[PDB]
Ligand SMILES: Nc1nc2c(ncn2[C@@H]2O[C@H](CO)[C@H]3O[P@](O)(=S)O[C@H]32)c(=O)[nH]1
């Protein structure tokens with residue numbers, strides 16, 4: 001069973017922890033990867049009811065199992081805060097345009 005289901009993509013807690021650690025590391029060092037500069041600030045225009053405090057940062061999580069290192073980020077993202085606390089897992093899949101919906 002999936003801990004997080006983003007459309008057709010299935011993730012475990014390990015997948016999420018691995019992705020988050022990478023993105024948080026880059027955030028801490030003040031570095032970015034990709035043409036869209038990840039990780040970067042996630043404003044939460046959607047207004048998700050996250051259990052942890054802002055600021056939030058988004059980092060791509062890949063269905064391939066690899067850690068994002070550039071190129072197409074896919075539709076899925078892990079959102080974490082300043083304290084490396086997981087806020088949630090969101091996706092563009094099933095959402096209009098560039099909006100997001102939570103992964104169930
Ligand atoms: N939909 C959405 N995009 C945001 C938000 N904060 C920052 N963005 C960035 O704005 C871009 C347009 O939606 C998005 O491409 P993305 O790379 S997944 O990073 C997203 C937010 O709260 N909602």
Ligand SMILES: [Ca+2]
Pocket residue numbers: 010011012015065
């Ligand atoms: Ca996996």
